[PDB]
Amino acid sequence: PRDFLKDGMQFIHKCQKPDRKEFKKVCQAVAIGFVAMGAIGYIVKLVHIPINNILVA
């Protein structure tokens, strides 16, 4: 019903929220890692598309 929702909201209000600087730093680091993995994967796939199309014929 609603008792669980009220309990969850109580626990949420009991918690502590992150500030702006720490949030910005962690977001920037996670974005750096994400962009690194994505760029590596994209470059590998784009460089293997024509190699594969030539190889397998």
């Binding site: 502590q16 977001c27 994400f34 994209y42």
Partner: protein
């Protein structure tokens, strides 16, 4: 009785001393690049690759690829531990642990061989009667050596040269690849009227530059409703930001030691307790039931119970139990059918919450156990005359877990229904794994 088989297996040597952090990161990145360049290469025995892909809902979950050297790569790694942990639980010294590890590796390679055999023989790569007598075993060895290479590389990454395990990286790199390729895709899909670009940014640029009206160009670049666009990119970026912000909800409970006086401390209990288990196992259950639906509707084409379980059409599940568990495609299909949407909402929320609440007991981090663990380690509550660890811990943990389950379920639903690029499950499995590895890295060397 398993002694003579021990010295035969190849095994990566132990590290000489503690390895630094830069060398560790280099090793991890290099093995990742090797994994990727290996998964992006075609096999040799391929003759007929135009068929319905069996076990197509397990590719993303097992980080594999069809028609490449990595058709089975990570499957031997998982199954070994997944069967040996249960065998040990059903029923030590290093002389026995070495034999245990050797038996585990031998079972892993045997299951790899068998799985490759049942793949090549069932007819995925064509009828073996017209494929060739020797090309079949050529494909067999070409695949088994790949399985051995991947298991040995995972062993090298796990022995200590790598900062973590290989399973999480392999699962997350494919998601990152398929989520960044969806933006700058070079492939153009000519559907008539003149070809258009698949990637979001490329399509936006091409439309803005070539079409005679910038108004229609932008009205097309936004809200394409048929191919990935930039609005979905903004949606997935917003989901990413929301998850990164929400991950940092931790309740710090004050705790001061009692074995060495004075030293303070903290024991956090995050809102996302059991970070990515109630999504991982839920996606596993969904994939398994979908695979069973497909395999039971293909053979038994006409039956009341099979039609009740799941019906398919060009695939896409419709009019069945498997149709309710399938996520709404976009906002249009979500607006057309209300009952399907609300049933999906309720199922995802309840399943995720209850699954987290039943996994918290098996994981071993239950209050009745972690309270005893901290009481044995020496710590005591640091409150003002409130010396009761078990009461507060058991009043904080259950709500935290049963709310984090529902919250991450609602986040996955919002991502999958708003129209975010890729399945929301992939987005969550990427974000959470990357964040865990980020904190692990920041806790080591800088």
């Amino acid at each position: 009785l398993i002694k003579p088989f021990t010295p035969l297996l190849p095994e990566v040597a132990a590290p000489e001393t503690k390895v630094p952090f830069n060398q560790k990161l280099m090793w991890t990145g290099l093995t990742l690049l090797i994994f990727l360049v290996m998964s992006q290469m075609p096999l040799y025995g391929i003759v007929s690759s135009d068929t319905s892909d069996p076990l197509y809902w397990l590719r993303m979950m097992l980080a594999s690829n069809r028609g490449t050297l990595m058709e089975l790569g990570i499957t031997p790694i998982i199954s070994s531990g997944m069967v040996f942990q249960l065998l040990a639980g059903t029923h030590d010294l290093k002389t026995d642990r070495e034999l245990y590890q050797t038996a585990q590796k031998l079972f892993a390679i045997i299951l790899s061989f068998g799985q490759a055999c049942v793949h090549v023989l069932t007819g995925l790569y064509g009828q073996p009667s017209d494929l060739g007598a020797g090309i079949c075993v050529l494909l067999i060895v070409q695949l088994v050596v790949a399985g051995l290479v991947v298991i040995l590389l995972d062993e090298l990454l796990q022995k200590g040269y790598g900062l973590g395990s290989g399973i999480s990286l392999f699962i997350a790199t494919n998601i990152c690849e398929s989520i960044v390729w969806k933006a700058f895709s070079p492939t153009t899909i000519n559907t008539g009227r003149g070809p258009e670009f698949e990637g979001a940014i490329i399509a936006l640029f091409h439309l803005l530059l070539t079409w005679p009206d910038k108004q229609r160009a932008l009205r097309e670049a936004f809200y394409r409703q048929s191919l990935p666009n930039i609005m979905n990119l903004l949606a997935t970026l917003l989901v990413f930001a929301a998850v990164i912000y929400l991950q940092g909800f931790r309740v710090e409970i004050p705790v001061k030691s009692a074995r060495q006086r004075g030293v303070r401390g903290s024991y956090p209990v995050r809102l996302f307790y059991t970070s990515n288990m109630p999504i991982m196992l839920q996606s596993a259950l969904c994939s398994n039931v979908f695979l069973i639906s497909q395999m039971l509707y293909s053979r038994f084409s006409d039956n009341l119970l099979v039609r009740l379980l799941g019906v398919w059409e060009p695939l896409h599940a419709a009019s069945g139990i498997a149709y309710y568990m399938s996520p709404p495609l976009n906002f249009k299909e979500a607006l057309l059918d209300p009952v399907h949407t609300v049933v999906y909402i309720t199922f995802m929320l309840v399943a995720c919450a209850l699954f987290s609440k039943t996994w918290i007991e098996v994981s071993g981090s239950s209050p009745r156990d972690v309270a005893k663990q901290l009481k044995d380690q020496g710590l005591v509550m640091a409150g003002h005359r409130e010396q009761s660890m078990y009461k507060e811990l058991k009043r904080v943990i259950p709500t935290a877990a049963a709310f984090g389950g529902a919250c991450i379920g609602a986040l996955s639903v919002a991502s999958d229904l708003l129209g975010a690029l890729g399945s929301g499950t992939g987005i969550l499995l990427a974000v959470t794994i990357i964040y865990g590895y980020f904190e692990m890295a920041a806790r080591e060397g800088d």
